[PDB]
Amino acid sequence: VSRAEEFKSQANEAFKGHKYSSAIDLYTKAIELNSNNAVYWANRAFAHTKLEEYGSAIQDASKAIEVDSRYSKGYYRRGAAYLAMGKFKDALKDFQQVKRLSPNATRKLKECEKAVMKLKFEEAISVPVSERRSVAESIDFHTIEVEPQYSGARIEGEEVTLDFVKTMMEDFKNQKTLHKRYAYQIVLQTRQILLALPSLVDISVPHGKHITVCGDVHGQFYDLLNIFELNGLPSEENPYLFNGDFVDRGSFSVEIILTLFAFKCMCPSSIYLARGNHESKSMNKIYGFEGEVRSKLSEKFVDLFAEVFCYLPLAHVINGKVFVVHGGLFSVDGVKLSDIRAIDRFCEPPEEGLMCELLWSDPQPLPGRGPSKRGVGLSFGGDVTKRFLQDNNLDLLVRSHEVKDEGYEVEHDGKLITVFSAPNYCDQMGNKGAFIRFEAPDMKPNIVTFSAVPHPDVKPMAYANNFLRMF
Ligand code: NI
Ligand code: NI
Ligand code: NI
C-alpha cells in the first residue's frame, strides 16, 4: 500500500521539470493513499505556490501543520504563501513558529517583524484616492526644464507623435531613460483620457478591420517589442487590447507602461488598456513596479501611477460579441453589462464585490462555484460562463490572469479562452506566449503563439520587496 511514495516520486519529477500542474495532480494521488505524511502536504503546498495559487498553498500547509505541529516546513510554506498575498501579519505568526521550532529562521523572522512595522506605517497613512488631490493639481509638465545634455527622446510640442514613440522605444531597448518632463506629459495625458471612460468600454471593430488581444505582459518589455515585430505596432488600423497586468514581476515595467501609455496618447483608438489586479497599490508595493518607478523616475510618480491605474476600465466588449476581462466572472448570477459599466472604479480593488471578482477570479473545469485557489475572489464553472454570456447576448469570454504552457487554453465548451502574453514567465516557466486576432464581422478567434526573446541581464523582482525576493 506504499503506492503513495510512487506518486510522490513521480510528482517530484514533474516539479524538477517545471510541470507544476502535473506535480500537483500526482501529489494529490499520493495524498489520496497516505494523508498522514506531512511532507506530502508541504510538497503540494509549494507546488501551488509556484503557480501563484496561494489559497491552496495555505490550506495544504495548514494540513501539514495538523499532521505534525513541530514540522517547521509546514509553517514555512504557509508563511511564504501569506507573504505572497501581502499578508505580512498572518505570515509573522508562522515565522514565529519556525523560530520556536528551530532556535539555531532568525533572518526571516526579523525580516518579517520589520515588514510588519513598515506595513503598520503604510496602513496608518492610507487614504482613499478619491479623497486626495491628484498630483496633476501640483504638477505641470510645461514648467519642467529639460537640460541640454539630455540625449533621449523629446516631445517637441503638445502632441505625442509616432516618431517620438519609435525613438523612445529604441532608447528603452538600449536601457536608456525618458526625461521626467516627457514622462509626466504622457501619464498626465493618459489620466485625462482614462477618466472620461466608462467602467466597461465598447470596442467597435468595423467591417474588414481587426484587433489584437494580449494577455499579461508583466514588465517583459523585450517580449512586448517582439509582439510588435510579429504583429505590427499599435495604430488605428492595427489596434491592441492589453488585458491587464502590464507591470510587476518583470523588471522592465516602466518601459512597458510608458510605451503603452504613449501609444494611447498618440492615438486613443490604437490601444485599449484594461485594469488587472497588478495595476493596484497592494501589488505594486511589493512586486516591483513601485520600486522600479522610485528608481527610474521619482516618488511623485508613484502616487500618480496609482491614481491613473484607478481610472483604468474594468472590462471591454468587442462588437457586442466578445467580453474581455482580466480575471473572470462573479459569485452571483444575473450581473448585466450595465452593472459593470456603472461601477465606481476610481479606487483600489476592494476585498469583495464585482470589481474584486472580475479582477481576481479563475475558471474551474467542473460546473458550479468554489473557493479560489488564490484565496481571493472565487472560481466559476462552465455553467456560470454560459449563463452570463446568454444573459448578456454575448458569444465568447476572453480572459487572462493565469499562466499557460502554450500561452492560451480554451475552456468551458469553447465559451472561455485564457490568453497570456508573457513567454518564459519570470525567466523560468518556459511557457509560450499568445495573442488573439479578431477580424470583423465573423469575430472568430485567431490564436497566435510566440516564444521568449533575449533581454539584458536584469533579474525578475529586482526592484521588488526584499523580503518577498527571498522566496
Ligand atoms: Ni493577474
Ligand atoms: Ni498575472
Ligand atoms: Ni497575478
Side-chain angles (χ1 to χ4, degrees), residues 1-9 11-12 14-15 17-18 20-28 30-103 105-351 353-389 391-443 445-471:
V1 211
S2 184
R3 275 189 308 273
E5 285 289 312
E6 173 200 16
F7 293 110
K8 130 89 171 298
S9 188
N12 292 331
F15 197 100
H18 299 257
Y20 306 114
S21 187
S22 292
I24 290 175
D25 296 338
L26 298 175
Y27 288 124
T28 304
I31 288 176
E32 285 169 354
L33 305 168
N34 184 12
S35 61
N36 200 67
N37 193 318
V39 329
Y40 288 178
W41 295 94
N43 285 345
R44 197 175 76 174
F46 193 17
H48 283 296
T49 302
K50 297 298 300 180
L51 290 177
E52 306 175 7
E53 298 170 351
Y54 305 129
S56 302
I58 291 161
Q59 189 175 347
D60 280 350
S62 293
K63 180 57 182 178
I65 290 168
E66 185 181 20
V67 171
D68 186 7
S69 63
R70 290 191 63 85
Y71 175 56
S72 69
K73 279 304 178 59
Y75 301 97
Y76 183 82
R77 296 303 176 191
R78 189 209 267 163
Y82 273 131
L83 288 181
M85 303 180 66
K87 299 184 176 179
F88 292 109
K89 296 178 183 177
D90 295 283
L92 179 64
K93 302 193 303 181
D94 296 315
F95 291 114
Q96 284 170 336
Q97 302 280 25
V98 178
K99 174 64 179 180
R100 179 181 57 87
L101 298 174
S102 307
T106 295
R107 176 182 75 122
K108 282 166 179 168
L109 176 58
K110 284 299 178 61
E111 288 288 347
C112 196
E113 289 171 347
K114 184 175 183 171
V116 171
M117 310 226 72
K118 175 75 170 301
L119 178 60
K120 232 165 291 187
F121 177 75
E122 289 173 352
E123 291 176 351
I125 67 180
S126 178
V127 170
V129 67
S130 59
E131 304 181 14
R132 298 184 56 174
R133 298 164 59 92
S134 172
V135 323
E137 299 184 32
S138 61
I139 292 168
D140 173 25
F141 73 87
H142 292 104
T143 71
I144 304 180
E145 303 168 0
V146 172
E147 63 276 7
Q149 300 90 344
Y150 169 78
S151 57
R154 295 179 180 245
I155 302 178
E156 298 296 340
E158 302 287 324
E159 217 79 278
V160 176
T161 66
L162 182 60
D163 271 85
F164 165 80
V165 179
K166 289 179 181 177
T167 302
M168 185 187 65
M169 283 188 294
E170 180 68 22
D171 287 337
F172 283 167
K173 182 172 181 56
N174 295 313
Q175 300 185 88
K176 267 52 177 293
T177 191
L178 182 72
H179 195 273
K180 299 182 192 66
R181 175 193 173 97
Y182 307 128
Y184 271 128
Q185 183 169 2
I186 294 170
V187 181
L188 290 177
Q189 182 177 357
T190 299
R191 190 186 71 102
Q192 234 96 277
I193 293 172
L194 293 182
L195 62 79
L197 294 177
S199 298
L200 179 143
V201 168
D202 286 285
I203 299 182
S204 56
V205 175
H207 186 92
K209 301 304 180 185
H210 64 260
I211 189 180
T212 297
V213 179
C214 293
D216 322 26
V217 283
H218 273 299
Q220 301 185 197
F221 176 73
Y222 295 82
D223 295 314
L224 176 69
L225 294 180
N226 185 43
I227 295 178
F228 291 162
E229 263 289 336
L230 297 169
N231 196 60
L233 293 178
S235 71
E236 185 177 356
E237 287 300 316
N238 191 42
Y240 276 79
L241 165 57
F242 286 87
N243 196 36
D245 283 26
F246 340 105
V247 302
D248 279 341
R249 304 206 176 89
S251 301
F252 312 98
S253 293
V254 166
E255 290 77 7
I256 282 194
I257 203 66
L258 284 177
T259 295
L260 301 183
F261 282 7
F263 274 112
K264 192 62 172 183
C265 294
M266 183 195 68
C267 177
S269 66
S270 72
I271 194 168
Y272 301 87
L273 306 174
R275 191 172 194 176
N277 57 318
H278 274 270
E279 277 76 46
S280 57
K281 189 172 72 176
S282 72
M283 293 292 101
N284 295 340
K285 176 195 310 174
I286 57 187
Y287 273 107
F289 184 59
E290 183 178 337
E292 200 180 322
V293 164
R294 291 186 178 278
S295 176
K296 298 177 178 174
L297 300 170
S298 58
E299 64 179 36
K300 276 268 186 56
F301 278 92
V302 173
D303 289 337
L304 177 55
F305 272 118
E307 177 197 1
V308 170
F309 285 180
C310 289
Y311 278 131
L312 286 165
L314 302 180
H316 293 78
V317 174
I318 312 176
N319 288 14
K321 301 149 91 292
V322 186
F323 179 83
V324 189
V325 68
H326 187 71
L329 295 181
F330 316 96
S331 59
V332 290
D333 301 280
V335 174
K336 303 289 190 294
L337 301 187
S338 52
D339 295 291
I340 308 178
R341 185 180 288 109
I343 292 176
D344 191 349
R345 71 189 187 272
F346 188 46
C347 59
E348 293 298 327
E351 304 296 333
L354 299 177
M355 182 173 174
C356 172
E357 292 175 350
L358 64 87
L359 291 181
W360 277 95
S361 305
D362 300 290
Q364 61 178 39
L366 301 183
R369 290 179 169 93
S372 171
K373 289 182 174 181
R374 306 173 183 259
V376 29
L378 245 71
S379 54
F380 60 95
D383 55 325
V384 176
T385 297
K386 291 170 178 176
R387 294 193 297 254
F388 178 84
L389 295 178
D391 212 25
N392 292 284
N393 289 320
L394 296 159
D395 289 335
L396 179 70
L397 197 152
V398 176
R399 49 87 69 170
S400 300
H401 195 35
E402 276 185 309
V403 60
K404 297 294 177 182
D405 291 332
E406 311 293 337
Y408 77 100
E409 180 170 0
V410 176
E411 289 187 69
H412 294 183
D413 293 310
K415 310 299 284 183
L416 185 150
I417 304 176
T418 294
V419 59
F420 193 84
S421 305
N424 195 17
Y425 187 50
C426 302
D427 290 334
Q428 75 179 250
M429 291 298 308
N431 59 287
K432 291 184 174 300
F435 53 83
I436 311 181
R437 294 178 60 101
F438 288 99
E439 179 178 349
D442 297 338
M443 293 277 93
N446 176 23
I447 309 176
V448 178
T449 63
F450 61 95
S451 296
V453 110
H455 62 67
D457 189 26
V458 181
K459 269 57 175 299
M461 307 281 285
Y463 298 87
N465 182 281
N466 299 86
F467 190 23
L468 195 50
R469 295 178 64 207
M470 304 177 181
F471 297 82

